[PDB]
């Protein structure tokens, strides 16, 4: 979970010279150190105290619940970089101020992971609220699942029917 091992030969010769990008700051991922070595690249995490995982939000009181779920909409600012992301909760950490930050990062038509489709993040971020919401459920489950066949509560089938991102944050806003 900490290391990431990239073969040399799955990058074009031509954009080797762009695996730095990897490991620069950003304000929307982990902090990565890139090492290089005879056939891969690593890269290793620097995950500390500062950082706070997705899943300790499920014991939070109900507004700053909240107020973290809405924040990961913030991560969307990612699409306008180089930068491609995984919404998940290995992915998924937060700031002291609970702004949201992702730990794998690929390369736009460089290196994985390829971006989602907007339905897909979706999807994904519903299953986040849900999980939020009740610490029992799995996210890979929900992720992988015939969504609407869903069996759960009143709360569980008003997240999954959202249409779209922006109604999904009208409910939550909505929850307060």
Same mark, same amino acid.
Do not use: W
């Given at each position: 979970?900490?290391?990431?091992?990239?073969?040399?030969? =799955?990058?074009?010769?031509?954009?080797?010279?762009?695996?730095?990008?990897?490991?620069?700051?950003?304000?929307? *991922?982990?902090?990565?150190?890139?090492?290089?070595?005879?056939?891969?690249?690593?890269?290793?995490?620097?995950?500390?105290?500062?950082?706070?995982?997705?899943?300790?939000?499920? =014991?939070?009181?109900?507004?700053?619940?909240?107020?973290? /779920?809405?924040?990961?909409?913030?991560?969307?600012?990612?699409?306008?970089?180089?930068?491609?992301?995984?919404?998940?909760?290995?992915?998924?950490? *937060?700031?002291?101020?609970?702004?949201?930050?992702?730990?794998?990062?690929? /390369?736009?038509?460089?290196?994985?992971?390829?971006?989602? !489709?907007?339905?897909?993040?979706?999807?994904?971020?519903?299953?986040?609220?849900?999980?939020? *919401?009740?610490?029992?459920? !799995? *996210?890979?489950?929900?992720?992988?699942?015939?969504?609407? /066949?869903?069996?759960?509560?009143?709360?569980?089938?008003?997240?999954?029917?959202?249409?779209?991102?922006?109604?999904?944050?009208?409910?939550?806003?909505?929850?307060?």
């Amino acid at each position: 979970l900490d290391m990431r091992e990239i073969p040399k030969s =799955s990058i074009k010769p031509e954009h080797f010279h762009l695996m730095y990008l990897l490991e620069q700051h950003s304000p929307y *991922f982990i902090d990565a150190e890139l090492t290089e070595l005879r056939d891969s690249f690593q890269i290793h995490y620097d995950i500390n105290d500062n950082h706070t995982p997705f899943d300790n939000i499920k =014991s939070f009181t109900k507004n700053e619940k909240l107020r973290y /779920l809405l924040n990961i909409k913030n991560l969307e600012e990612v699409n306008r970089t180089r930068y491609t992301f995984v919404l998940a909760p290995d992915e998924l950490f *937060f700031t002291r101020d609970g702004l949201p930050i992702a730990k794998t990062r690929g /390369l736009q038509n460089v290196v994985d992971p390829l971006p989602v !489709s907007e339905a897909e993040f979706l999807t994904r971020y519903k299953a986040l609220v849900i999980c939020a *919401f009740n610490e029992k459920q !799995s *996210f890979d489950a929900l992720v992988e699942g015939n969504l609407e /066949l869903h069996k759960g509560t009143p709360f569980e089938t008003k997240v999954i029917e959202a249409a779209t991102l922006d109604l999904l944050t009208a409910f939550l806003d909505e929850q307060y």
